[PDB]
């Protein structure tokens, strides 16, 4: 579609010394607005946002048997305590349980993963770097505009996957529910990288408000975990100034 | 499935002077508890809770084309200024827009409405009283045990309808979302009736918490719109009592 720059939105980045981009699209990706035309199409490691395509692929290949599959913890150390338990698919997405999705990816395997990222037009579609880590430290990259396009297809059930499996993943992604206000969303954080090679933090999703829908994707450069609150506050301020929130 | 009476729950009922029942079922043990086995099996006007089967039937028959159908307000006054606006299916359910569901019912028509309520085993299956009003002043009746059976089937996608259509109605029914706590629910209120033959107020739905699922159905006698808040107050206090929050 078309991407239109709104430089007034940089106010929210400038204040916090943040280098990043917000892409926000009403109704469709036919017309999106952004603070940074160039960065809106610049591609970055997806980190935990990749759990969305991975969940769809796991269901499509039958690796995830169905919506009520329980991912059992084997009792062995996992890198975060909140992952050391049995999880549903929703649970695994919402607590961002990487080892659940690593095992999903291993079972999907390289051939099938490559096939579905091509079907989904997902970023640079580059899965090299290890089947269980390409989206964590490999060569996979996707832009904020491309995240919006992917999530719009998911919203419309237009990905090349069953409608059932798109609906399953959508319910797992609900993060805020009010009578006329529904948010689907997913956070991501690649890590702190370095000073000269920063990590990336993401917030992607969509807002359904009355009869209208808004697709959004935010990323920022980050080299310190203490800046992570900005990954939600900057795009929240912008959507509020648009009267969305 | 089993059911057991827990007299202790009459606590929250006597306190605020209410005649009603709570049924709470843990999916993994296939075990339910209720304060009153007799009233758990008594059958009542479903009122707004019928919007759950009505929505599914509307989708199954194609009266509702799909999840992105907008129900346009025709500018004719409605009993609630909340309903005087375009609505998505989720919005119609969450705001409980009777006029939208009366029209759905009319388009489904008696023969098809009768068919699905039999397939769904929905209460006494008697839709006599007018195709657009059987569930609110007609003869249709359903018990709290029948509600949790029906909702358990919906959760499991085991109703005799498309998986897709069940998934659509399920997301429409989400009312609270946290990373490991997801609530689907629907309220109902038939009116004040008489103080001879009161009306009924419902709360039904289910809670997904970690990997457990709890199905619940509440109803109570109500003569005074005044006491509508206790429908949610009493089951919440019971569920809180059971560690479900
Ligand atoms: C996926 O990308 C990755 C996880 N994503 C993120 C993320 O926040 O996007 C984390 S952060 C990690 C999990 N919870 C801890 C935390 O500090 N969260 C935090 C701190 C301050 C603000 C916020 C917020 O407002 O969102 C969150 C540390 C994690 C790397 C994989 C591993 O799941
Ligand atoms: C459906 O049965 C019927 C509506 N159901 C409800 C209901 O509350 O179950 C009503 S009540 C009507 C709408 N909003 C007003 C109200 O007072 N709501 C209220 C009051 C106290 C507590 C709560 C709560 O915690 O949810 C809500 C009056 C309406 C009869 C219609 C949609 O078909
Ligand atoms: Mg990650
Ligand atoms: Mg650093």
Author numbering:
A (entry chain A), B (entry chain B): 20 to 264
Manuscript excerpt for this entry:
Carbapenemases are the main cause of carbapenem resistance in Gram‐negative bacteria. How β‐lactamases with weak carbapenemase activity, such as the OXA‐10‐type class D β‐lactamases, contribute to anti‐bacterial drug resistance is unclear. OXA‐655 is a T26M and V117L OXA‐10 variant, recently identified from hospital wastewater. Here, we have solved crystal structures of OXA‐10 in complex with imipenem (IPM) and ETP, and OXA‐655 in complex with MEM in order to unravel the structure–function relationship and the impact of residue 117 in enzyme catalysis.
